[PDB]
Design a protein around this ligand. Structure first.
Ligand SMILES: [Ca+2]
Ligand SMILES: [Ca+2]
Lengths: 302, 301
């Protein structure tokens, strides 16, 4: 399998009509289909398991994983910009004076209808894990908008999907700054070597530190002047490193060799059982990180 | 028009063609576009654009030339998928057979199929030759790209023997000193941006922005043994830029005064604003370059 690289977490508002044999059925109708030559972008469900399965969901232990594929046309803004000018300059190559607003909404779409068919595609695929035990959904993506596009896709397949982001009692920057300031992260977590420190004032001073000793007074000074820690590298139990972000997100997930290789003795042949072992392993482990991290950051606002 | 970055290079010998002879050797290597099947194409274009059909503009021993590059927007995955898809059709009846010269003559057909569909990416690169000082300045942020444009000119001219400025003293150490001492060399004043790197292979990088660099938080990094490998500077309240320890100047901001000092009774006529703005920019950045070899120690061996 492919492990999460990044994480946006959501609380699902106290259950879904999740009958997984009708879940599969609802996702089936939004399975992925490729773009027609006038489509910009399509999106839809694919097998979390690959060519190796036809199933749109995988379930193991009240954990569901689902996969969203996106196809986007490679049509750069400078390419369209020139096509248009070339033709807007060609009227005028026989009597100048251009004009005007809803004129080159018609001209602009000739170029789009014209260029669109030849445009190549770019592919993206986002995995999404739903923990029915914790009532939480984890999206393997680096941006809020990408996680919101998959959630909307999901909520369209299923009708309603009331999620919110996790919101903490204490602000994150302020819990992060005190871990650095006191020289120790909350129980479970340890401080690595990478941080972002911002002044409280737009325009007052941003410090990005890498491969640096954080509990050192070089860093201390920054906090002591008014800066707050807005991104902190963390290691949980010798087993999972990540950047904690002040917006509640986890960037650049790294799983230790020992979890990655844990199931090395599975034939290298049955992909369905390798995915099965790896999935139960990843989700129990991220689940237990999340529970501990909520608590290290001082608890959810209730 | 105005440079955004700057790489500097000493021209080891006198040029000693003549600019109507240069003009003519650059006419021969003039840009023409990509054919449906070409992939990429590079050559020289009027630095002045539409307003002139000449490939060189000259003023006061200051020549400027301009390279244009075009490359097909054709990703290696799109290639890959179209090839693999096609092999996965000669899986009708097997004979895996010549995945050496059948898959081989296959790429050519994918390429030939896809190249005409592919859209184009364009870049231009201004190149300014200071015959007086024997320097060449390329408006580019990467050394790859400056070496591409010199290559073009060394093909157009036969020979271009060039070297990057080499400082007697490493630039980091001078940068560091100015941040330790609280002050840049005369003509320059420290701005609010710096990268600080430790000497050990394994040590921190500090990137600061919108930061006051004459303060304990910065200089403590220096006491801790970090060197300033990039420092933001203002030359004479006219030009801001970032000095790098590889020797290059990034993110040139010319003060409004200069941008506007030819604003007045120049209207429709582009050709005059160009010469005027060009004379002005060259002579101004010629000063900075001189004032900054001095500021920085000096050159050479
Ligand atoms: Ca320490
Ligand atoms: Ca100060």
């Amino acid at each position: 399998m492919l492990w999460f690289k990044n994480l946006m977490v959501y609380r699902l508002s106290r259950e879904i009509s999740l009958r997984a044999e009708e879940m599969e059925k609802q996702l089936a109708s939004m399975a992925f289909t490729p773009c027609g030559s006038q489509d910009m972008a399509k999106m839809g469900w694919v097998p979390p398991m690959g060519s190796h399965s036809d199933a749109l969901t995988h379930v193991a232990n009240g954990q569901i994983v689902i996969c969203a594929r996106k196809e986007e046309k490679i049509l750069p803004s400078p390419v369209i910009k020139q096509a248009l000018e070339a033709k807007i300059a060609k009227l005028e190559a026989e009597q100048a004076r251009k004009l005007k607003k809803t004129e080159k909404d018609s001209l602009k779409d000739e170029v789009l209808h014209s260029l669109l068919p030849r445009a190549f595609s770019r592919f993206s695929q986002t995995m999404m894990w739903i923990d029915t035990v914790n009532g939480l959904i984890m999206v393997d993506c680096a941006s809020a908008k990408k996680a919101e596009d998959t959630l909307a896709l999901l909520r369209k397949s299923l009708g309603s999907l009331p999620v919110v982001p996790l919101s903490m009692e204490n602000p994150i920057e302020l819990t992060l700054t005190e871990w650095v300031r006191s020289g120790s992260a909350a129980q479970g977590f340890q401080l690595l070597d990478e941080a972002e420190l911002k002044s409280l004032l737009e325009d007052g001073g941003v410090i990005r530190a890498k491969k640096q000793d954080l509990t050192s007074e070089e860093i201390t000074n920054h906090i002591e002047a008014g800066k707050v820690v807005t991104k902190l590298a963390l290691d949980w139990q010798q087993r999972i490193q990540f950047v904690m972000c002040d917006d509640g997100s986890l960037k650049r997930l790294k799983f230790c060799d020992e979890l990655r290789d844990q199931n090395e003795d599975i034939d290298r042949e049955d992909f369905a059982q390798r995915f099965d072992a790896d999935f139960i392993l990843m989700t129990g482990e991220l689940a237990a990180l999340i529970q501990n991290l909520i608590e290290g950051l001082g608890g959810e606002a209730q």
